[PDB]
Amino acid sequence: LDSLLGQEKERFQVLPGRDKMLYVAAQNERDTLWARQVLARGDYDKNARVINENEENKRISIWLDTYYPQLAYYRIHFDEPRKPVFWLSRQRNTMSKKELEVLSQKLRALMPYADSVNITLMDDVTAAGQAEAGLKQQALPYSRRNHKGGVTFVIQGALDDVEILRARQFVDSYYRTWGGRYVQFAIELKD
């Protein structure tokens, strides 16, 4: 295991994949750069590869939005890099725990380096609850415009440089933990 010449090796999340391929899902750009540049230094090809969470997040919207399209998932929770928790809807889901047993392998089919991928059922009544309570916490209005598969929230008012950030920073993490479709966000600007 690494088994690279691309030092420094600090913060390297390097682990072997499903078909014996060392992926490097590091959290920093310079930490993937050090592992990506060396790939041609010492002929660390084929077996040694370098990935990231940004592409894995795309995979969520490409392979997992179409494999169980009915399953209302949120997002692969990277709390445990070795076994990320795959937050699901509690009542908007379609895959039972018997079927989720197979989804976990598919989840690893998009994340071979991880030992596994956990799966949980998270309340969809609290997905909306965080949206309603978070904007309210952030001192912001919001509408309840129902779209297919969720409820679009529309924040009335020409929010200023920072008040508008209140919701931009909120939603930034919301869709990474509560899905980007169950509640659509929008800020209506006026006056």
Place this chain on the structure above:
Amino acid sequence: LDSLLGQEKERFQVLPGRDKMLYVAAQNERDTLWARQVLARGDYDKNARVINENEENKRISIWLDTYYPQLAYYRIHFDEPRKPVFWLSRQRNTMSKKELEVLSQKLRALMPYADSVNITLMDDVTAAGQAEAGLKQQALPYSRRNHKGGVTFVIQGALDDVEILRARQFVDSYYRTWGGRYVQFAIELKD
């Protein structure tokens, strides 16, 4: 099997065809370029060829729009490159499962490199359902203008740079998975 001098060979979907001809249906341009340029390097002619999904999509509208013209198909689903699923209409079709057994060979007659081509019957009530629910999801109006072999959808309103993309990105994948004739799309612009 490849059996080419045109390295790098990463992501090459190279397989022998029906009449022993290695096709390279790679997903990237540089991955067909590496395999296409070498064709004259080492005399990798006749047997070694290079194809793509763009031409295969044309074939769908030329050879398959006229071979079973009555059959209401959607599109060759490249989910399985070795055995693409050929989505059909459930109620607008003409070829029964007994006849579809032959269509699969014709489907390979336009895709020799693939082991086979799968065929399924997909609900035409959900083809319109995705169109109605997808635009609605994307917060967009639409009309129901019935044309011969479908229902043209017309989206009222001078959509802006991104709101207009909402439907452009939607339809982009729609016609690749639900056919480009069962629901025609259009955005009426005004004001």
Place this chain on the structure above:
Amino acid sequence: LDSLLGQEKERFQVLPGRDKMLYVAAQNERDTLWARQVLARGDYDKNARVINENEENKRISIWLDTYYPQLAYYRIHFDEPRKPVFWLSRQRNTMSKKELEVLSQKLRALMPYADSVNITLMDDVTAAGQAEAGLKQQALPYSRRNHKGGVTFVIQGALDDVEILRARQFVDSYYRTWGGRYVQFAIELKD
């Protein structure tokens, strides 16, 4: 123990971590600079590291805002660098003393160098009480705008250079000892 060549070593809070790693949580910038620059002088790598309270305060809002998200905590009180007191809410908390026994290890998981991390239950009736009494002490008005998880305070009036500091200096320490969400502060400016 230090076991560095980066003299002067005055005011160095250097202690070994959970996995035998000497951290230097010094209070001054020049006192982390002296210990950070030497890391490459004598090959004081891996084992010898240098940290601060600013990053540990971020950790509070990243790892501890999401590990027991229900637990209404205030802030890691650095009164005892070796065993900081982790002020909690008295009535807005979720972790009982039986569960807090585990939180302390998690608290050290974000502060390995410290022998431990203490945990107490501080009255939330006095968290608001300091806010109400502190601004009043500082001769300042304030509103009671209830937000989710607290009560936003809004100070009426175009406070001048120093009168406005009265609350800016107050809140500066408030959120370090009474949490930055139980009472949100704001100064409305007018006239």
